[PDB]
Ligand binder design. Structure first.
Ligand SMILES: [Cl-]
Ligand SMILES: [Cl-]
Ligand SMILES: [Zn+2]
Ligand SMILES: [Zn+2]
Lengths: 30, 21, 30, 21, 30, 30, 21, 21, 30, 30, 21, 21
């Protein structure tokens, strides 16, 4: 896997892909 | 945190994995 | 606003949209 | 859970807010 | 709901989510 | 180019792609 | 409408242009 | 307009709602 | 069709739309 | 990581994610 | 092909790497 | 190449078509 440059919803997409049925939490600063 | 790091810099899928439940 | 089927990555995109900076959790197993 | 509420059934953008932090 | 920073196709995604079966028009400047 | 099923948010993404600056309407009820 | 043309059936990128402004 | 405002500044879902049919 | 300004995954989306069942290759520099 | 159904544009998004700079091919006919 | 492996069946992110260049 | 051109400048669907298999 390659390093990722991921902003906004692209991060959430990536988390979704990576985590699958485990799901994930999205916790941005502030 | 991961959100800011992935955007302002890069991040790996392996770092993203930490955020799975 | 409306109600629709939001699945998979679409679900998480909508979460991101609605929650944004608050962050969210996507926990499909419940 | 969210999948049943929003994918299997349908849910509003207000219901989606149930899953914000 | 939180305020949104939405460019390009992300806006169209957001409009799609917000409007549902009502649909929407996308009318950028120029 | 090809022909494919474009549904929901995918449909609007393709509209955005094809129409861009012209803008478009997405009117599922017709 | 577009949904019938493009989702239910299939449509080309040229047909999608039917819905541009 | 809404397209430029959401991108160069922010916009709310409630402002986006105005663009529904 | 209008000209496109497409970065990151947006390019891959556009290629997917344009190419359909033909598929495509994505070959960024470096 | 997990295993999930990745179809259509979602498949290509995941390819983009996994392959990035390497690039990839999306060849649905095989 | 990828569609059978990843869409029709399921595949891991590692299997997806099979289709990188 | 096409990836850099579409991002740093613009590109047409017709140029994208060249990248289909
Ligand atoms: Cl972007
Ligand atoms: Cl889908
Ligand atoms: Zn984007
Ligand atoms: Zn989808």
């Amino acid at each position: 896997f390659v390093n990722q440059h991921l902003c906004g919803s692209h991060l959430v997409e990536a988390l979704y892909l990576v985590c699958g049925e485990r799901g994930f939490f999205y916790t941005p600063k502030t | 945190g991961i959100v800011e790091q992935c955007c302002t810099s890069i991040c790996s899928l392996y770092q993203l994995e930490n955020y799975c439940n």
